[PDB]
Amino acid sequence: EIIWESLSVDVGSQGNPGIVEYKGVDTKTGEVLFEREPIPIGTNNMGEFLAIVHGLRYLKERNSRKPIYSNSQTAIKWVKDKKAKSTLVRNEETALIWKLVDEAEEWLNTHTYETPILKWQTDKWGEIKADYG
Amino acid sequence: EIIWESLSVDVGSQGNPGIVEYKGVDTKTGEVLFEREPIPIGTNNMGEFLAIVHGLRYLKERNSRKPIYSNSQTAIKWVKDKKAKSTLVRNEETALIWKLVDEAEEWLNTHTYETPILKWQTDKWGEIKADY
DNA sequence: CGCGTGCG
DNA sequence: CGCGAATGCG
Ligand code: NA
């Protein structure tokens, strides 16, 4: 049931809350299409939410037909609701990750996109291609 | 275990939310010591909350040694916490019970009192004497 | 660590 | 109907 001609995102975390990075890779080859530099403090869910919206922006910029895959049931919901329901405090330490979540929410509120967001079923398909471990 | 020399309070409720009233009775004699005309819209829990605090002001004014009995676990805890955790919407129609509950909370925030608040154990001792 | 079913 | 407390993957 898996669509190989597609985009897979995943978040690497050094603690949660902790340092967060993410990347988007080709599901078939493994080529890294985009990647973002580690953020000092955020949650895993905030990272997945940014990773999805970033892949959405990358695919729309390119008029792609690739679905986007994520293994985070929570962040897919957040993206579809256009609202990231994170509990993380809002201080100077967390201001970068929150600025990026706010602008991603703003992009979802002002843009259409035809890329379907698909669940990656790990228990069935193995690690998502973009896994960091 | 039952302190017969005490006060019992209870809420009369037609619907919840709905019209709620309450009264304090002497546990032994049944004699009605205070009584609240029906409020148009309230919850039982808020009615109970008010009935306990009414008992406490009633009992403090007369320097009584009576405990207060209530069979509502929720409202007994709300009084101890000085906070009535009702989910009733605040609107014109519910302005009155919220006024009374806000004022009942403010009384608890500002007053000491010595009468203990005890759980009436309906399963072991039958009906609370203030039952409508 | 982060997230979404006794009685008055 | 209103209320209080617990108890699955990245
Ligand atoms: Na009662």
PDB file of all heavy atoms in Angstrom, chain A residues 111-123:
ATOM      1  N   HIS A 111      -2.242  29.125   2.370  1.00  0.00           N
ATOM      2  CA  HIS A 111      -1.824  28.411   1.169  1.00  0.00           C
ATOM      3  C   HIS A 111      -2.599  27.119   0.961  1.00  0.00           C
ATOM      4  O   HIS A 111      -2.866  26.375   1.913  1.00  0.00           O
ATOM      5  CB  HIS A 111      -0.330  28.090   1.216  1.00  0.00           C
ATOM      6  CG  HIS A 111       0.552  29.298   1.136  1.00  0.00           C
ATOM      7  ND1 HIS A 111       1.041  29.941   2.256  1.00  0.00           N
ATOM      8  CD2 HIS A 111       1.036  29.977   0.071  1.00  0.00           C
ATOM      9  CE1 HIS A 111       1.794  30.958   1.883  1.00  0.00           C
ATOM     10  NE2 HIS A 111       1.809  31.002   0.564  1.00  0.00           N
ATOM     11  N   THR A 112      -2.924  26.847  -0.299  1.00  0.00           N
ATOM     12  CA  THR A 112      -3.424  25.544  -0.701  1.00  0.00           C
ATOM     13  C   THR A 112      -2.254  24.652  -1.089  1.00  0.00           C
ATOM     14  O   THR A 112      -1.122  25.112  -1.261  1.00  0.00           O
ATOM     15  CB  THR A 112      -4.411  25.647  -1.876  1.00  0.00           C
ATOM     16  OG1 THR A 112      -3.865  26.480  -2.911  1.00  0.00           O
ATOM     17  CG2 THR A 112      -5.764  26.207  -1.417  1.00  0.00           C
ATOM     18  N   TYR A 113      -2.533  23.357  -1.192  1.00  0.00           N
ATOM     19  CA  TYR A 113      -1.531  22.387  -1.608  1.00  0.00           C
ATOM     20  C   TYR A 113      -2.266  21.092  -1.905  1.00  0.00           C
ATOM     21  O   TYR A 113      -3.278  20.789  -1.271  1.00  0.00           O
ATOM     22  CB  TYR A 113      -0.426  22.183  -0.542  1.00  0.00           C
ATOM     23  CG  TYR A 113      -0.893  21.659   0.818  1.00  0.00           C
ATOM     24  CD1 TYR A 113      -0.974  20.280   1.076  1.00  0.00           C
ATOM     25  CD2 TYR A 113      -1.253  22.542   1.845  1.00  0.00           C
ATOM     26  CE1 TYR A 113      -1.402  19.798   2.328  1.00  0.00           C
ATOM     27  CE2 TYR A 113      -1.681  22.074   3.087  1.00  0.00           C
ATOM     28  CZ  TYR A 113      -1.753  20.709   3.316  1.00  0.00           C
ATOM     29  OH  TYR A 113      -2.165  20.274   4.546  1.00  0.00           O
ATOM     30  N   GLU A 114      -1.767  20.347  -2.889  1.00  0.00           N
ATOM     31  CA  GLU A 114      -2.424  19.124  -3.324  1.00  0.00           C
ATOM     32  C   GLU A 114      -1.692  17.861  -2.876  1.00  0.00           C
ATOM     33  O   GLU A 114      -2.266  16.773  -2.955  1.00  0.00           O
ATOM     34  CB  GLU A 114      -2.573  19.112  -4.858  1.00  0.00           C
ATOM     35  CG  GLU A 114      -3.444  20.228  -5.446  1.00  0.00           C
ATOM     36  CD  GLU A 114      -2.764  21.582  -5.367  1.00  0.00           C
ATOM     37  OE1 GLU A 114      -1.579  21.663  -5.782  1.00  0.00           O
ATOM     38  OE2 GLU A 114      -3.391  22.556  -4.868  1.00  0.00           O
ATOM     39  N   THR A 115      -0.449  17.983  -2.417  1.00  0.00           N
ATOM     40  CA  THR A 115       0.309  16.918  -1.775  1.00  0.00           C
ATOM     41  C   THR A 115      -0.512  16.272  -0.660  1.00  0.00           C
ATOM     42  O   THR A 115      -0.823  16.947   0.330  1.00  0.00           O
ATOM     43  CB  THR A 115       1.602  17.499  -1.178  1.00  0.00           C
ATOM     44  OG1 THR A 115       2.455  17.951  -2.227  1.00  0.00           O
ATOM     45  CG2 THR A 115       2.346  16.454  -0.407  1.00  0.00           C
ATOM     46  N   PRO A 116      -0.866  14.986  -0.767  1.00  0.00           N
ATOM     47  CA  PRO A 116      -1.488  14.310   0.375  1.00  0.00           C
ATOM     48  C   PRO A 116      -0.433  13.990   1.427  1.00  0.00           C
ATOM     49  O   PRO A 116       0.706  13.640   1.108  1.00  0.00           O
ATOM     50  CB  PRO A 116      -2.050  13.030  -0.248  1.00  0.00           C
ATOM     51  CG  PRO A 116      -1.031  12.690  -1.298  1.00  0.00           C
ATOM     52  CD  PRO A 116      -0.495  14.022  -1.822  1.00  0.00           C
ATOM     53  N   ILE A 117      -0.813  14.146   2.693  1.00  0.00           N
ATOM     54  CA  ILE A 117       0.038  13.781   3.822  1.00  0.00           C
ATOM     55  C   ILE A 117      -0.350  12.372   4.271  1.00  0.00           C
ATOM     56  O   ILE A 117      -1.476  12.141   4.735  1.00  0.00           O
ATOM     57  CB  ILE A 117      -0.105  14.782   4.968  1.00  0.00           C
ATOM     58  CG1 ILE A 117       0.167  16.199   4.469  1.00  0.00           C
ATOM     59  CG2 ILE A 117       0.822  14.416   6.112  1.00  0.00           C
ATOM     60  CD1 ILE A 117      -0.224  17.238   5.469  1.00  0.00           C
ATOM     61  N   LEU A 118       0.584  11.426   4.144  1.00  0.00           N
ATOM     62  CA  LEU A 118       0.316  10.015   4.402  1.00  0.00           C
ATOM     63  C   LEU A 118       1.028   9.535   5.660  1.00  0.00           C
ATOM     64  O   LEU A 118       2.174   9.922   5.935  1.00  0.00           O
ATOM     65  CB  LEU A 118       0.744   9.154   3.213  1.00  0.00           C
ATOM     66  CG  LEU A 118       0.005   9.506   1.926  1.00  0.00           C
ATOM     67  CD1 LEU A 118       0.317   8.496   0.819  1.00  0.00           C
ATOM     68  CD2 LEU A 118      -1.520   9.635   2.182  1.00  0.00           C
ATOM     69  N   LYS A 119       0.347   8.665   6.399  1.00  0.00           N
ATOM     70  CA  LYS A 119       0.945   7.980   7.536  1.00  0.00           C
ATOM     71  C   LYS A 119       1.965   6.941   7.068  1.00  0.00           C
ATOM     72  O   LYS A 119       1.680   6.115   6.197  1.00  0.00           O
ATOM     73  CB  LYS A 119      -0.151   7.306   8.360  1.00  0.00           C
ATOM     74  CG  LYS A 119       0.288   6.731   9.694  1.00  0.00           C
ATOM     75  CD  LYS A 119       1.086   7.741  10.468  1.00  0.00           C
ATOM     76  CE  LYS A 119       1.179   7.343  11.913  1.00  0.00           C
ATOM     77  NZ  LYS A 119       2.282   6.379  12.175  1.00  0.00           N
ATOM     78  N   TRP A 120       3.165   6.988   7.633  1.00  0.00           N
ATOM     79  CA  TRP A 120       4.117   5.902   7.459  1.00  0.00           C
ATOM     80  C   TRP A 120       3.832   4.868   8.542  1.00  0.00           C
ATOM     81  O   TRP A 120       3.829   5.199   9.730  1.00  0.00           O
ATOM     82  CB  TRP A 120       5.552   6.408   7.540  1.00  0.00           C
ATOM     83  CG  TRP A 120       6.554   5.311   7.285  1.00  0.00           C
ATOM     84  CD1 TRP A 120       7.265   4.606   8.225  1.00  0.00           C
ATOM     85  CD2 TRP A 120       6.938   4.784   6.013  1.00  0.00           C
ATOM     86  NE1 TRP A 120       8.071   3.680   7.611  1.00  0.00           N
ATOM     87  CE2 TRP A 120       7.892   3.765   6.254  1.00  0.00           C
ATOM     88  CE3 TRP A 120       6.573   5.072   4.693  1.00  0.00           C
ATOM     89  CZ2 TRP A 120       8.489   3.033   5.217  1.00  0.00           C
ATOM     90  CZ3 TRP A 120       7.173   4.342   3.651  1.00  0.00           C
ATOM     91  CH2 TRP A 120       8.108   3.335   3.923  1.00  0.00           C
ATOM     92  N   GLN A 121       3.526   3.644   8.137  1.00  0.00           N
ATOM     93  CA  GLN A 121       3.223   2.582   9.094  1.00  0.00           C
ATOM     94  C   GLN A 121       4.521   1.845   9.386  1.00  0.00           C
ATOM     95  O   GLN A 121       4.969   1.023   8.585  1.00  0.00           O
ATOM     96  CB  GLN A 121       2.161   1.635   8.546  1.00  0.00           C
ATOM     97  CG  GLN A 121       1.042   2.328   7.816  1.00  0.00           C
ATOM     98  CD  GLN A 121      -0.192   1.467   7.753  1.00  0.00           C
ATOM     99  OE1 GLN A 121      -0.509   0.761   8.715  1.00  0.00           O
ATOM    100  NE2 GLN A 121      -0.902   1.509   6.625  1.00  0.00           N
ATOM    101  N   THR A 122       5.137   2.142  10.533  1.00  0.00           N
ATOM    102  CA  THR A 122       6.447   1.563  10.814  1.00  0.00           C
ATOM    103  C   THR A 122       6.348   0.056  11.063  1.00  0.00           C
ATOM    104  O   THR A 122       7.151  -0.717  10.522  1.00  0.00           O
ATOM    105  CB  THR A 122       7.101   2.271  12.003  1.00  0.00           C
ATOM    106  OG1 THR A 122       7.490   3.606  11.631  1.00  0.00           O
ATOM    107  CG2 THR A 122       8.351   1.511  12.444  1.00  0.00           C
ATOM    108  N   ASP A 123       5.345  -0.384  11.834  1.00  0.00           N
ATOM    109  CA  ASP A 123       5.141  -1.796  12.168  1.00  0.00           C
ATOM    110  C   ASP A 123       4.909  -2.672  10.940  1.00  0.00           C
ATOM    111  O   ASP A 123       4.670  -3.879  11.063  1.00  0.00           O
ATOM    112  CB  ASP A 123       3.939  -1.943  13.102  1.00  0.00           C
ATOM    113  CG  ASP A 123       2.636  -1.512  12.435  1.00  0.00           C
ATOM    114  OD1 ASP A 123       2.662  -0.552  11.626  1.00  0.00           O
ATOM    115  OD2 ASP A 123       1.585  -2.125  12.724  1.00  0.00           O
TER     116      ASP A 123
END
